[PDB]
């Protein structure tokens, strides 16, 4: 019964939509789904030099890449929420089913 | 003879073993998060890998 829908994405709005879609949309089937938990945002920073050569003032680019992770938890067998997850998915959001 | 003179000098580490996955150039390499990309090529392909300038 311990199934976690693990929603990880880079964009915030596609992740809020898809997570709310399995909470707001998963209202009128009387499911026992527990509220949304947000893991701390993993901010991947790579600081390179702008210049191809070594010439001029030392200017650096600071490329960031914020990636987010969210948990959906419920006490029911597999196909009762594979009905829910299979419909209206996003390329941007990666969703992994942990049945155990 | 010369088939003991291709890569018989053992290649298990150093700057000669690894290079960028676009050019095969041995300098300014980024191994961070398994890019294996030269700093010029990364700054070119920053936008289209997913990296953003905000700060």
């Amino acid at each position: 019964h311990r199934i976690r829908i693990t929603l990880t994405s880079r964009n915030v709005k596609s992740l809020e939509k898809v997570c709310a879609d399995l909470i707001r949309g998963a209202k009128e089937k009387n499911l026992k789904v527990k509220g949304p938990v947000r893991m701390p945002t993993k901010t991947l920073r790579i600081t390179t030099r702008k210049t191809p050569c070594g010439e001029g003032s030392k200017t650096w680019d600071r490329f960031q890449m914020r990636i987010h992770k969210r948990l959906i938890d419920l006490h029911s067998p597999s196909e009762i929420v594979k009905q829910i997850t299979s419909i209206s998915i996003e390329p941007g959001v990666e969703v992994e089913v942990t049945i155990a | 003879g010369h088939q003991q003179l291709y890569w018989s000098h053992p290649r298990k580490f150093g700057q000669g073993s690894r290079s960028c996955r676009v050019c095969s150039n041995r300098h300014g390499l980024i191994r961070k998060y398994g890019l294996n990309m030269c700093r010029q090529c990364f700054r070119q392909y920053a936008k289209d890998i997913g990296f953003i300038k905000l700060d």
Binding site: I67, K69, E94 | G34, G50
Partner: peptide, 19 residues
């Protein structure tokens, strides 16, 4: 996956694949 590539590398791996 057996080597089980982490979340900070999965986004990178799809990114470099797209490029």
């Amino acid at each position: 996956m057996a080597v089980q590539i982490s979340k900070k590398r999965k986004f990178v791996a799809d990114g470099i694949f797209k490029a």
